[PDB]
Design a protein around this ligand. Structure first.
Ligand SMILES: *[C@@H]1O[C@H](CO)[C@@H](O[C@@H]2O[C@H](CO)[C@@H](O[C@@H]3O[C@H](CO)[C@@H](O)[C@H](O)[C@@H]3O)[C@H](O)[C@H]2NC(C)=O)[C@H](O)[C@H]1NC(C)=O
Lengths: 400, 48
C-alpha cells in the first residue's frame, strides 16, 4: 500500500494514478499541485534610494578667515570662499572687501522617500522548496496540505501521509544577486556595500532603512557664490537610484522561463513547472475494501467514437462491461498516452457505459484499466479544426 | 547664527505614503488566431 510513482511537475493538472493492491478493491489517487513555491535563501545587503543634499545655513565673517572642521557626517564636504561681498536684505553685509570670507557645509542624507520607496539588494542561496497539494483520493474528497519537497520530511495531514521530491532540476530563476523593488525583482549585480560609484546604482547605501549610519559616494562638489549673494551652490551627480529606475532591464517577474510568477512575501518563485517529482503516499488500510464486495469486470469489449486530436477531452469511448455485481468500479489508464476525465463509474449487471478522455496520438493504443481487469481501446483520431485554445490538459506528446 | 544650533524638530507636514492611484486601462486587443501564430491587433490610446 505504500505507493510510489513519478509525476511531472505542473500546477493545474491532476496526476490520477491507480493503487492496485491484490486481494482488495483498487483505490485511485488524485494528486494536484496548487502552489510550487521555490523560496530561495535570502540575505539583505543594503537599501538604496534617492538622496537629499541637506545644506546647513552657511557662516559668514566680515573680516578674517574661518577654518573648517571635518564633521563625521556622511560625505561631509566643507570648503571656504574668500573675496565674497554678499549683498542681502538691507544693503551690503560687510565692508572688508578683501578680508570677507564665507564657509559652506554640505552633507548627504537619505531622503524621506527611502522609508517607503527604496530598492533592496539581496544574496540568495539554494534554499528549500515547498508546495500545496490536493489529494481527493478514495471517498475522502478533501485536502489542504502545505508540504516541504525535501524527500526526508513527509507531510502528515488527514489520514494518508506523503513524501514528495526532492525536485529533479534546480533551475531557480534567481541569479546570484537579486534586487527587489516594490512588486518587481531583477537579476542586477549591485556592486558592493561601501563601494558604490556615483551616478550608477548603489550611490546611496545603508545597511537598513532605519540605520543611522550610511554611505554616500555622490561626488559632491561645492561652488563659489557669484555676484555676492548668500547661498551655497553645489554640483552633484544626479541620483544613482534615479538611474536604473528609468533604464531598468526587463524584470525577472516577466522574463522568468517555465512561466513562473514571482512574489515578495518571503521572496519566492511559484508555479515553476520544470522536471518531475517522485511522489510517495502511505494509504491507510481502513480505506481499502475486500475484493469480494466490488464488481469483477471480465469479458469486456471497447469501442471509441469520434476522437479529436485536441488538448481538451476530445476523446469519447464505450465499453461493454460484463460485471459480477452491481456498484462502482474505479477506472484508469496505466499508460501515459491517455488520460481519463472520469474518476469512477457505476455498473449495473452487465451493462454498458461511456467515458470521456484526452490524448495526443493519432492512433491511441492504450490499455484501459478497470477494477482488476484491462482492455485495449485502440482506435483512430482526427486533427483539431481550430487554433483558439488557452491552456492544455494532457502533455503526452511522443512518437506518432 | 554665530552661536548654538537651537533644537526643535519641526515635523514635515506632508510625508510620502503608499496610496492607491487610478491608472489608465488600454483598449482590449483584437486577437486573430493563425497556425502556430498569434496575430494581435492593437489600438493603443497612449504609449503602453
Ligand atoms: C481538491 O480537488 C477537488 C476535486 O477537483 C476540489 O473539488 C471541487 O471544488 C470546487 C471548488 O473549488 C467545487 O466547485 C463547485 O462549483 C459550483 C459552481 O460554482 C458550486 O455551486 C459549488 O458550491 C462548488 O464550489 C466542486 O464541486 C468540487 N468538486 C466536486 C466534484 O464536487 C476541491 O475543492 C479541491 N480542494 C482544494 C482545497 O483545493
Amino acid at each position: 500500500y505504500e505507493h510510489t510513482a513519478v509525476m511531472p511537475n505542473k500546477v493545474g493538472i491532476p496526476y490520477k494514478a491507480l493503487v492496485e493492491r491484490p486481494g482488495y478493491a483498487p483505490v485511485h489517487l488524485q494528486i494536484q499541485l496548487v502552489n510550487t513555491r521555490i523560496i530561495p535563501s535570502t540575505n539583505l545587503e543594503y537599501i538604496t534610494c534617492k538622496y537629499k543634499t541637506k545644506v546647513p545655513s552657511p557662516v559668514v565673517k566680515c573680516c578674517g578667515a574661518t577654518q573648517c572642521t571635518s564633521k563625521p557626517h556622511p560625505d561631509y564636504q566643507c570648503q571656504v570662499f574668500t573675496g565674497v561681498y554678499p549683498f542681502m536684505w538691507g544693503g551690503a553685509y560687510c565692508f572688508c572687501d578683501t578680508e570677507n570670507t564665507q564657509m559652506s557645509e554640505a552633507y548627504v542624507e537619505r531622503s524621506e522617500e527611502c522609508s517607503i520607496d527604496h530598492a533592496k539588494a539581496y544574496k540568495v542561496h539554494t534554499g528549500t522548496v515547498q508546495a500545496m497539494v490536493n489529494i481527493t483520493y478514495g471517498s475522502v474528497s478533501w485536502r489542504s496540505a502545505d508540504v516541504y519537497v525535501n524527500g526526508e520530511t513527509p507531510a502528515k495531514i488527514g489520514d494518508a501521509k506523503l513524501i514528495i521530491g526532492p525536485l529533479s532540476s534546480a533551475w531557480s530563476p534567481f541569479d546570484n544577486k537579486v534586487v527587489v523593488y516594490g512588486h518587481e525583482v531583477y537579476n542586477y549585480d549591485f556592486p558592493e556595500y561601501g563601494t558604490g560609484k556615483a551616478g550608477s546604482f548603489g550611490d546611496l547605501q545603508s545597511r537598513t532603512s532605519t540605520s543611522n549610519d550610511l554611505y554616500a559616494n555622490t561626488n559632491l562638489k561645492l561652488q563659489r557664490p557669484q555676484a555676492g549673494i548668500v547661498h551655497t551652490p553645489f554640483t552633484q551627480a544626479p541620483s544613482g537610484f534615479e538611474r536604473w529606475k528609468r533604464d531598468k532591464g526587463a524584470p525577472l517577474n516577466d522574463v522568468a522561463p517555465f512561466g513562473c510568477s514571482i512574489a515578495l512575501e518571503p521572496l519566492r518563485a511559484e508555479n515553476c513547472a520544470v522536471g518531475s517529482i517522485p511522489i510517495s503516499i502511505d494509504i491507510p488500510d481502513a480505506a481499502f475494501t475486500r475484493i469480494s464486495e466490488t464488481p469483477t469486470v471480465s469479458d469486456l469489449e471497447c469501442k471509441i467514437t469520434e476522437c479529436t486530436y485536441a488538448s481538451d477531452f476530445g476523446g469519447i469511448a464505450t465499453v461493454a462491461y460484463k460485471s459480477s455485481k452491481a456498484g462502482n468500479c474505479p477506472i484508469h489508464s496505466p499508460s501515459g498516452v491517455a488520460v481519463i476525465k472520469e474518476n469512477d463509474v457505476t455498473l449495473a449487471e452487465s451493462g454498458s457505459f461511456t467515458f470521456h478522455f484526452s490524448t495526443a496520438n493519432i492512433h491511441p493504443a492504450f490499455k484501459l484499466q478497470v477494477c482488476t481487469s484491462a482492455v485495449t481501446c485502440k482506435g483512430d483520431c482526427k486533427p483539431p479544426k481550430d487554433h483558439i485554445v488557452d491552456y492544455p490538459a494532457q502533455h503526452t506528446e511522443s512518437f506518432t | 547664527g554665530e552661536g548654538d544650533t537651537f533644537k526643535g524638530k519641526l515635523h514635515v507636514p506632508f510625508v510620502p505614503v503608499k496610496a492607491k492611484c487610478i491608472a489608465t486601462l488600454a483598449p482590449e486587443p483584437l486577437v486573430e488566431h493563425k497556425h502556430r501564430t498569434l496575430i494581435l491587433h492593437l489600438h493603443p490610446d497612449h504609449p503602453t
